[PDB]
Symmetry: C4
Subunit: 466 residues, 4 copies
Amino acid sequence: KYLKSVLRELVTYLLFLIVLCILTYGMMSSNVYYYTRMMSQLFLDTPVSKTEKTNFKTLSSMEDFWKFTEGSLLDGLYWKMQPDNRSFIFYENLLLGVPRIRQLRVRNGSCSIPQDLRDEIKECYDVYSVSSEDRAPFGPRNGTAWIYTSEKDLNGSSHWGIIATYSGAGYYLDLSRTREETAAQVASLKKNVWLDRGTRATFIDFSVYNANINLFCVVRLLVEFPATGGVIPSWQFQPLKLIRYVTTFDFFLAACEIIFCFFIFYYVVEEILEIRIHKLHYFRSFWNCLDVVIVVLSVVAIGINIYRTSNVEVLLQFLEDQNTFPNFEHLAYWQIQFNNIAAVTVFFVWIKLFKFINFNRTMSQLSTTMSRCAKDLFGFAIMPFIIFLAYAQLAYLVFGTQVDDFSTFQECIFTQFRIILGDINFAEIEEANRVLGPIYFTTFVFFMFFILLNMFLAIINDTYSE
Amino acid sequence: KYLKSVLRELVTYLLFLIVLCILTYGMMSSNVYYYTRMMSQLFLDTPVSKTEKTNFKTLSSMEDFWKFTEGSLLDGLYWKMQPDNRSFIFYENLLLGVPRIRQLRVRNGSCSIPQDLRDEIKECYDVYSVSSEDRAPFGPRNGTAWIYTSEKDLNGSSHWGIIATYSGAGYYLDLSRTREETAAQVASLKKNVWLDRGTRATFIDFSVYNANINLFCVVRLLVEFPATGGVIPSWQFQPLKLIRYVTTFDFFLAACEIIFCFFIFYYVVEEILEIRIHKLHYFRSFWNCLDVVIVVLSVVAIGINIYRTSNVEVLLQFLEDQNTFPNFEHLAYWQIQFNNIAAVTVFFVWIKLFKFINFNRTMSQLSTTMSRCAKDLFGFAIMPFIIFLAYAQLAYLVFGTQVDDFSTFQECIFTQFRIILGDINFAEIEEANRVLGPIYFTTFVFFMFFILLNMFLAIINDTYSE
Amino acid sequence: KYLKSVLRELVTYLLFLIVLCILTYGMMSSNVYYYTRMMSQLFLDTPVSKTEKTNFKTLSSMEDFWKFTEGSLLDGLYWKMQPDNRSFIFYENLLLGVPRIRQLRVRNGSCSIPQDLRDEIKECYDVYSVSSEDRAPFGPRNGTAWIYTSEKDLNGSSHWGIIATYSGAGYYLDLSRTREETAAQVASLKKNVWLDRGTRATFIDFSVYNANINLFCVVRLLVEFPATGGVIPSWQFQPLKLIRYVTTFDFFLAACEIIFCFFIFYYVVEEILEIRIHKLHYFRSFWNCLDVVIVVLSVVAIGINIYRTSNVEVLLQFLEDQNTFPNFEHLAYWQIQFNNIAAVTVFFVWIKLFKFINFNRTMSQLSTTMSRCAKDLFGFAIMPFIIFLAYAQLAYLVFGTQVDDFSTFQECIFTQFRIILGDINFAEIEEANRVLGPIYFTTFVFFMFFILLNMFLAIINDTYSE
Amino acid sequence: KYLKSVLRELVTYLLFLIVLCILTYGMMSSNVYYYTRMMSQLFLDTPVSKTEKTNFKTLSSMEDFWKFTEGSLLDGLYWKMQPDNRSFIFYENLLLGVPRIRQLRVRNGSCSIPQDLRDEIKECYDVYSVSSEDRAPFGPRNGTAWIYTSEKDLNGSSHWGIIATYSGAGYYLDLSRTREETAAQVASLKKNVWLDRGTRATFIDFSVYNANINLFCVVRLLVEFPATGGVIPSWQFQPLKLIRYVTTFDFFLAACEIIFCFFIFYYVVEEILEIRIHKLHYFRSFWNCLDVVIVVLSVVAIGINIYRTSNVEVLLQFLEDQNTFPNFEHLAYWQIQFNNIAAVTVFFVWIKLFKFINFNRTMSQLSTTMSRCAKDLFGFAIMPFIIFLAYAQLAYLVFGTQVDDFSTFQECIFTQFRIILGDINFAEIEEANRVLGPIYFTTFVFFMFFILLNMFLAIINDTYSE
Ligand SMILES: *[C@@H]1O[C@H](CO)[C@@H](O)[C@H](O)[C@H]1NC(C)=O
Ligand SMILES: *[C@@H]1O[C@H](CO)[C@@H](O)[C@H](O)[C@H]1NC(C)=O
Ligand SMILES: *[C@@H]1O[C@H](CO)[C@@H](O)[C@H](O)[C@H]1NC(C)=O
Ligand SMILES: *[C@@H]1O[C@H](CO)[C@@H](O)[C@H](O)[C@H]1NC(C)=O
Ligand SMILES: *[C@@H]1O[C@H](CO)[C@@H](O)[C@H](O)[C@H]1NC(C)=O
Ligand SMILES: *[C@@H]1O[C@H](CO)[C@@H](O)[C@H](O)[C@H]1NC(C)=O
Ligand SMILES: [Ca+2]
């Protein structure tokens, strides 16, 4: 044995945990936040013009977008020279290739205009959708900025924005490597009207490479044009690490990764043979059910890691010709996915530690606390739950067309959580509705704590009657 | 049965609930918040002049109001042309008809000036009231902007503003359909003094119609002139949906509405026959008392819905002549009322779910809680209540002339709730009173939790003695 | 009883309560906050110059003060004419008399300069105090702005500012009734240096009278010059109500006041004979000890009210000659004192309500809670208390020279209360000290709830053992 | 013993406590915060130029730093003359000596550039470290601003900045005593490029002395240049008190300090003979173990105090020649250390008071409370603890490259504490990650209170079963 088996399990789990911790510490670099901070400050906070005070974070119309495209964007992208034409941003960022600008359009007459308003209005444009997307040339064709390009010819993917989800095809244009030619191209796009009443989205893409610390950065600025009017901006900066095996620490990380997958295989093989006739009722105790989540997450993480390391050479064929657009979107997407999976896996492995500390005299504490008390809350706690969702629905129906925090129903849930915690924005609620606002606020705050106190009392009495 | 009856009740209630939920989902459109957001940003955030930094949200005097009326208001209302005169705001809004501006005045000498100050002051003007309202012509009569018009001749109703409630009559002027004529009219109003020391309110009204998503928007901006001086601005951006039966989904929603009123009739008829000699003591158990609130709310909602659908054609006679002012205030008012009633009804229907989940083994949980614990708080909880209102009155008497959060006594209640939750603005309280401010704050925060803890202890002891 | 006596006490107490409520409602006017709001916005928020963006609320040096005195102050005080020289601020405020500006100085050589730094520095000026105050003429005497005037000759009293308390005497100058003469006087003061290295405070006083609602307003702007450098501003706006008996409601309130003092006499006489040989042990039960506080507060409030109504005519002799400075500071001070006393009295009267609701079957509710539970917290609660003051002292010693929230030791108490509630400003603490800041924050937040919960458990266990 | 011994201990402890309180009150001056506040307002809030709106607190590039160095820095440091060349800042500060500017550089080619990117990039510079530091002359040597100076020759020590810890040596330049010469020197530094792609830090140092209250102020301005790009400003204002024994109160404080060291010696001598064969088990009861912490802290504080008073004359040899740079960094460092030690010592002495109030009938209060309740929380509380650190690690892995609250892992702990208290910044978390952000927030807030409540219940049940 009893003692030897549990000690062996404890020591092997400790080795697995320390290996995983070394992996996470090694892969997670330090002082990376300031790189993205400087990029975002340069591209989103500088005013679009010297006389104006408008920036990218607060855009209002197509005129502002045009002022930004030929203004603050060109100033912060093409740096003159340090003491060749390679545009070292901040003097060591080395803008890679050329940027690209792409738009998405919809079809005219994709609506059902009421017959009453048939003499005053003769054009309509639906909200963005795959069925309403436009695929015809417009304006002076004369190139690729006025001709639809399919999602397969244009090596892209689907980007999920604030309003809707966008396909990834459309009308694109590759800008130039210098300031003058790019400015001329943008002026030509502005002259021959490019954004006119049919545009529903616009993307700007480029990448930089910092030599002092090996990291790439992909910038994807998105401006959405709703069917009502105005614009909605989004930036989404993201760093990358493509080149590996540069220092001895990288080979040490490779070694710890391979022994880590060895531990994963050892756990899965030692856990799959004991789901056999013996211990066949294996789906209980909440500890044996977690060891399958651990191995599933580890297997998918290993699959992503070995699928993401086989493309660092195929997609860096850009080193041969540094004149075209380097497409690095998929690499950033898989970085994000792998980081999320690794964080979830390490969180679960860390919280699995309770199963070993319970075998000491803690059983009378842990046991009782997690059995007689962590089980009867989950019985009668739906009363807090049903009234929470009822209040969320009431807030979404009353507010949500006037208050930004109450649109998009899930944000009602998040706003209610913040209100319970103490993050209150009562001015906007008061301004929106002067009667139901205060009533909703006071009734919610009163009844949540009322019912919580009630349930607490109930459980105390149940314990006293037990 | 016993089982069959409760199962029948459960299934019919579930059908009613799903019908109500689908109705609410269908009627509540998506991404409506951005329409009002763009309107409000255009009209309330742009500076009144290029050199100035003052906007509508922060107005200070009549000079600022005059600068706004011929400045940012005209710029954001008349758009030049897209590539006729119809003024497509943001290129997709189509300002309907012409805007209207109206004011309310009071009579000179409606005061009782003290005999001591009788040689230095010879004019006085009371605060706004129906008895003090002015009804005489002034200045160069020459039209309708200088002649009183009754609330019956001028189609309108009262509006409940920040300081007082305004009748809805007064001196109005219909602006023009173009920028030049409207600017000339506003300049003529400014020259021959039209706002002079007697004005107590000013309204601006107009409407727009977005064709991409069929929705109207009624805008009314109210500027109040208190007897003390200065101005107070307000806004009531509210969307509308007048044209229906445009998509098959609308007819599906109509079918849902008719089956919903069928369920309402079925519930009321099955509930009114059983309030008879059998179960005559029907005003208890808190569940039978809720089913009458449900039917009352449903009946009033149905009445409002069928009264609001018979005027979508009578009041849209504006389509014949698009040169006058389209009056849509009542439609917006009834939209607001119907939305509030529907939200309350669905909230109550959702919280009615507890009576069916209780018939399973949950009765021993819900029982004690709402029979021994949710009742004895309501007995001894007035001590938290009396001292809460005493503190509110103390804060209203001490503060409230220096702090905006403590004027208008109900705001003392709301501020106390926010202080308990954790939203504190202690700087202004410290600045207002340097002695009673901190004393009140610390004593309130101490004593609230003191008495709460005390009551908790009391109830625990009562449970232990029972 | 027994019944008749308690019913008589209840009915007379409710009569007293309703009389007090009508008195307070009548004396407290409505919509007074906007008057002071407009005054403060006009005088504290407008930039000192058109090119500059500095206002009174954020002043930095003597140059800024000089720019404000001849800039935004003169613009917002002398209004040109409405369509005589009387300067109706906002067109109905009627600046009364002329404003006055006064300064306080200290003596040169009131220090003890170290002998080491005796060759580089030859002047010193102590912080403000009565012993260090200067009383000699300076500059070109030529009038009263360069000659000391005693606190008795100059009708005034002390004002308790931010840094210290100021005597109320000094060098004063009465400005003019028009813009040109006042500007010339301020320019002459600026030319012949009047604020020079010895000034420790500066006051600006004036008053206005609104005719639409009978109210005065006294403004006392204070700018402090610390011995280190810079300035600290303060404004302290305060309304007044001098003229009474103007409407019938005023006479109704007078009748309410006289019947109120009748009730006060009745209570004091009925309470004073029963502290006799019978019920001689009258200093217990917490209810008989409160009825003496009630009568003391009522007597002092009546004394203040009858002392403040006999000077509304003596000090309004300014109506005879409207060319000099109207001194209204004492009236505002007594308004503040009377309002504070009345608010405290009504709060105590409201919380006295518990003794009558207790004689019903509520008596068993409050025995344990006010006899067994409200007493044993006050026994073992000094551990929350001693560690609270120890933490306050630690925060005052560590911070307080870098953070504004931790200077002036009582503000450490207030900041700790706000931190417990949830109002955190962690950025400043992090910037101040990188080690003791976070340690103090986390340790305080952990240990406060640790000890509180522990005490709760102790109270429970004791109740279970009792 | 019994009574006499405990009374003697109580009275001697009271004497010690009052002596310590008098010492702390005497040493801690009043209204010191405003001195540093005015300095920081003058040097960090003024815009770098009249046309620009950028200040020191928000710097972005080397151009901004150059504009600040010859702009707002020179304006706020050299004041023209009061009605000699001594530059009385704010007219009472007397800038001491001359300021000094110093930089730190790294070596070119201190990287390992990948062989793939070997044709486009030919320079690299590692992050700051002692191994990568540059020690060679550059540019036109011609003086000491272009030649490395060791830490022993350049009197100084290391400083702990935001990104890393800097050595304290480098290339320095002593500015002039007047505005013109200093401006010329800064222009010459700007012309011959002095900050160029290798600079990793820059320091600015000076000091002032206020004669009205004898206090020095050392200002150190640090600007960090990360390898990624941009700048990170950092400041430090610290008052000093070098000259003592100026008033009689100083000699009284000296007497208090000496009698305090007599009390410390008496406590240590009476405590070291009691750890003898009698009561040799001295390391229990939590009271006997704290009296050694008290004496250790007191001894180290006395050592620092007597080591810091022997250099107030050695290092003030600058009085002989007021033309060079006065180095006062070590004095400020020891002020900070002594203040921290004294605050900790007085906090511990204050919280030690519980041992004397316990000998009255309070012993039963803290029996269960401090032996049965404060002990079993520390047993089963690691579940709140392990899941707290697991959540911190998850937040650091997911966020921390996009949100500044989650970089630098300890800030994850602090942000979690603030979130629990109620200080939420949910907009940034929502913008960074749209799926794991809300999930993490809601799950953390739910599970923390879930497990806390569970443990509370466990404790209650254990108490009831014991
Ligand atoms: C859009 O389509 C309608 C369909 O009849 C047509 O009348 C209108 O001219 C079209 N508008 C444009 C801009 O092509
Ligand atoms: C194509 O021709 C149009 C006019 O015919 C012109 O506006 C446009 O700039 C041209 N594009 C290119 C790429 O030459
Ligand atoms: C009416 O006449 C007055 C002057 O007599 C003039 O100011 C005003 O503009 C005129 N109004 C119209 C509508 O002509
Ligand atoms: C007094 O005389 C001085 C110069 O002698 C002058 O500056 C000042 O303005 C005069 N004051 C008055 C009130 O005339
Ligand atoms: C940095 O060192 C590399 C090493 O070869 C050299 O090629 C390059 O010119 C150097 N750069 C500078 C600025 O000295
Ligand atoms: C040293 O000489 C260089 C040019 O040779 C010049 O730029 C620099 O200013 C000189 N420095 C001094 C201190 O004279
Ligand atoms: Ca809170």
